[PDB]
Design a binder for this molecule. Structure first.
Ligand SMILES: Nc1ncnc2c1ncn2[C@@H]1O[C@H](CSCC[C@H](N)C(=O)O)[C@@H](O)[C@H]1O
Length: 316
């Protein structure tokens, strides 16, 4: 069972974590792994080998935070390391449903693609809804004065905090709660990698929560959004016969009443049982002429042929 491990950044000095992050930056994601990079790739490691790379203090920091577990003879990590877009991130290893804990954290399935779709501009205050590992928040922290990440999974909140400390980031905060409840005030930027995929209307789990989580999100967005703010959402959308997602969305957003502009970029689609249609896409709320537009953008395809330059893309 994966994703129930205890994560406790609060039990380590901020400096020790910052140094560990420095060490990880040198090796995570690079060829010829050192013992630290081996540890964070899921390989058990002799602790004296770690000692020479992170110090005995670093070694004790790894234990105290929950990043490492002492199997007597060796150390092992329940987490896996990533490095991308200027940040080091720990998350759960990519494993199948049957062995996931209820607090399993998104193992960065779509993060790198999503970061590349995001408008490159920065601003005053950003919100990362369902922050998971915290990866989107950490990237946003570089160009926002402050960033709040929220999740209902307490373990995601702890991991997010740890990941911010590892990167020595000071302007990013994380709170446990349900949707917007722990997010006070308005935001000039809201990003939401939604937990929607194949489940349609039905709650399966925190990573497939059903369409209602989008309804809640979009019904409340208008009161959480600063004038001129931007909203970006990864989501799965179900068009049913005589019942397109986009009409439900416009209803939720009070589109004309609140005077918002929404663009939906569809990347993938398939026919469904109903004679309806499933789609995956990227939704953007941004200042301009009121209304809703649908465009095609096979960014998943383009990401596969050449990741390194979708790019963005939406700025257009
Ligand atoms: N009611 C709710 N309130 C806040 N977050 C929720 C929620 N229901 C599900 N979530 C969270 O939404 C996230 C979706 S996965 C997104 C994770 C992260 N932003 C990434 O891009 O990798 C999960 O972390 C899940 O725990």
């Amino acid at each position: 069972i994966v994703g129930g491990s205890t994560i406790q950044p609060e039990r380590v000095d901020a400096a020790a974590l910052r140094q560990l992050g420095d060490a990880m930056r040198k090796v995570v994601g690079s060829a010829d792994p050192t013992p630290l990079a081996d540890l964070l790739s899921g390989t058990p490691v002799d602790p004296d080998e770690l000692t020479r790379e992170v110090g005995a203090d670093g070694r004790q920091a790894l234990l105290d935070s929950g990043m490492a577990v002492d199997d007597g003879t060796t150390f092992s990590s329940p987490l896996r390391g990533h490095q991308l877009h200027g940040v080091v991130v720990l998350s759960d290893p990519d494993v199948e449903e049957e062995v996931q804990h209820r607090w399993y954290v998104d193992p960065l399935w779509e993060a790198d693609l999503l970061i590349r779709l995001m408008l490159r501009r920065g601003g005053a205050r950003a919100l990362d809804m369902g922050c998971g590992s915290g990866v989107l928040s950490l990237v946003l922290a570089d160009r926002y004065e402050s960033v709040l990440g929220v999740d209902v999974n307490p373990r995601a909140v702890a991991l997010s905090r740890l990941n911010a400390a590892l990167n020595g980031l000071t302007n990013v905060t994380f709170r446990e709660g349900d949707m917007f409840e722990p997010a006070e005030g308005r935001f000039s930027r809201i990003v939401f990698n939604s937990p929607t995929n194949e489940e349609g209307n039905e709650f399966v789990d925190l990573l497939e929560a059903g369409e209602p989580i989008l309804e809640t999100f979009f019904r409340n967005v208008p009161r959480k959004l600063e004038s001129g703010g931007i909203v970006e959402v990864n989501l799965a959308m179900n068009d049913y016969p005589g019942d397109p997602f986009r009409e439900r969305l416009a209803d939720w957003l009070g589109l004309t009443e609140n005077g918002l502009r929404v663009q939906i970029f569809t990347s993938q689609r398939r026919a469904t049982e109903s004679g309806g249609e499933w789609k995956r896409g990227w939704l953007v709320v941004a200042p301009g002429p009121v209304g809703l537009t649908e465009v095609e953008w096979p960014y998943h395809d383009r990401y596969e042929e050449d990741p390194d330059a979708l790019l963005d893309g939406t700025d257009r």
